[PDB]
Write a protein that binds this ligand. Structure first.
Ligand code: CU
Ligand code: CU
Ligand code: CU
Ligand code: CU
Length: 471
């Protein structure tokens, strides 16, 4: 439990007036392709500490990809062949997980295959047909994923089709992260509440920028990334609506119109914005009560950014994407997410050391904590399965499974059933307290996969298991 560090008690945080704000939103920098061959993407990611003059007077220590905040975006096409050299220049082990991207387990940066401090690894994989979607990359080492993210390590990863219903549209990225700064402009350690609830950095950023001015138009294909450790968003633009056109694993069948867009941690969508006319709007997130513990919160709306919106009509087809007929499942899995508050009650009498033990045995899957060495579940290569994911705890947890996209079939809550509102492919899904979800998927590569809560602090505290995929 040496990975559990608590911030100083009554740590004072930075005054938000000191944080640069109100700037025009910039596009993410792209990770340069070192190769000139057709359909070949070659590049290098260095993972390193850097000191950034963000707050006047002060240098802020970040962990970065290629020394950049925000990180370089990877953008490739279906059918491309990728090779990325990754150099770990941190003083601790790390990995890169291509979150949601269908790659073989040995190319996917799980805590089984760490990159030690001072070493390097090459990741190599093909971009499959039909994999167009909106993904991201971030660390997944044992125990320290939450700190490495909160230090700055998260980047965009997009797979494009050579041609699809929206591929002629100009694109925009709204990559949403969050950042905590102390009174001396440094990124502090988690406190107890962050470990219990998942850490939410007070400064919520879009492409690394605080309260920016965004120029958008209604004929743009906008990718939105919830790249936070634990923050639930319920996005809205009063006076406008979202036209949902895609989820993690790409386009959906038909436009879905939404006044609010719920985006739990690690989820991504593609949207257009609809409004009747040109205008100036505000991007906000409505408070979502996720039953955080030891916190009484103001149910406040979070303001994220100003949007200057240009109205341009755009032709949208009747069908965005033709989905394959749903396949029949042949085996079934059950995932129970739960918590043990045996200990933690009597918070009052515990030393720092005993809180750490409590935290480490608290967040469970199928009544167990993560064991790096234990195979929890086994599935057959290429076989369609339904996974029944149930949340028996008092608080939301977003479920993630590596290696595949799944389709929500149906959900149940409070003794009632709701069939999915539309077919979509996701790799991460919120599970409400007492809710039961039915998720259809298959695994197309042999080897080990994890599945876990994607509130990063819960994952690091053991809310995770191992899946073995065999022939
Ligand atoms: Cu992830
Ligand atoms: Cu993942
Ligand atoms: Cu993971
Ligand atoms: Cu959780």
């Amino acid at each position: 439990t040496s990975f559990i560090n608590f911030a100083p008690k009554n740590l004072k945080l930075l005054d938000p007036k000191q944080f640069p704000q109100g700037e025009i939103l910039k596009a993410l920098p792209l990770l340069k392709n070192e190769s000139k061959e057709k359909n070949i993407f070659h590049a290098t990611l260095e993972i390193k500490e850097n000191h950034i003059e963000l707050i006047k007077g002060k240098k802020t220590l970040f962990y970065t990809y290629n020394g950049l905040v925000p990180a370089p975006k990877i953008e490739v096409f279906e059918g491309d062949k990728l090779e990325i050299l990754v150099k770990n220049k941190l003083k601790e082990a790390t990995t890169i997980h291509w979150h949601g991207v269908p790659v073989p387990p040995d190319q996917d940066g799980s805590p089984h295959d760490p990159i030690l401090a001072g070493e390097e690894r090459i990741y190599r994989f093909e971009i499959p047909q039909d994999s167009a979607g909106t993904y991201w990359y971030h660390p997944h080492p044992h125990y320290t994923a939450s700190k490495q993210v909160f230090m700055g390590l998260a980047g965009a990863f997009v797979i494009k089709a050579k041609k699809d219903a929206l591929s002629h549209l100009k694109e925009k990225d709204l990559m949403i992260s969050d950042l905590r700064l102390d009174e001396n402009a440094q990124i502090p350690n988690n406190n107890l509440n962050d470990w219990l609830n998942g850490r939410e950095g007070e400064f919520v950023l879009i492409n690394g920028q605080f309260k920016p001015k965004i120029k958008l138009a209604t004929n743009e294909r906008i990718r939105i990334y919830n790249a936070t450790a634990a923050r639930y968003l319920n996005l809205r633009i009063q006076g406008a609506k979202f036209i949902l056109v895609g989820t993690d694993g790409g386009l959906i069948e038909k436009t879905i119109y939404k006044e609010e867009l719920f985006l739990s941690p690690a989820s991504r969508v593609e949207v257009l914005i609809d409004a009747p006319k040109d205008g100036n709007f505000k991007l906000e997130s409505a408070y979502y009560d996720r039953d955080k513990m030891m916190v009484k919160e103001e149910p406040n709306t979070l303001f994220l950014a100003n949007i200057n919106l240009k109205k341009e009509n755009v032709e949208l087809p009747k069908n965005l994407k033709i989905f394959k007929p749903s396949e029949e499942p042949k085996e079934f899995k059950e995932i129970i997410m739960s918590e043990d508050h045996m200990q933690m009650h009597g918070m009052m009498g515990k030393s720092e050391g005993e809180l750490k033990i409590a935290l480490a045995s608290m967040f469970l899957i199928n009544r167990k904590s993560y064991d790096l060495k234990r195979i929890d579940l086994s599935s057959k290569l290429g076989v369609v399965e339904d996974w029944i994911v149930i949340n028996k705890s008092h608080m939301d947890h977003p479920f993630h499974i590596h290696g595949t996209q799944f389709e929500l079939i149906s959900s149940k809550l409070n003794g009632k059933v709701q069939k999915a509102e539309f077919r979509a492919l996701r790799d991460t899904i919120n599970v409400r307290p007492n809710e039961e979800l039915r998720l259809r998927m298959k695994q197309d590569f042999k080897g080990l996969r994890m599945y876990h809560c994607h509130i990063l602090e819960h994952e690091d505290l053991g809310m995770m298991g191992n899946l073995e995929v065999k022939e």
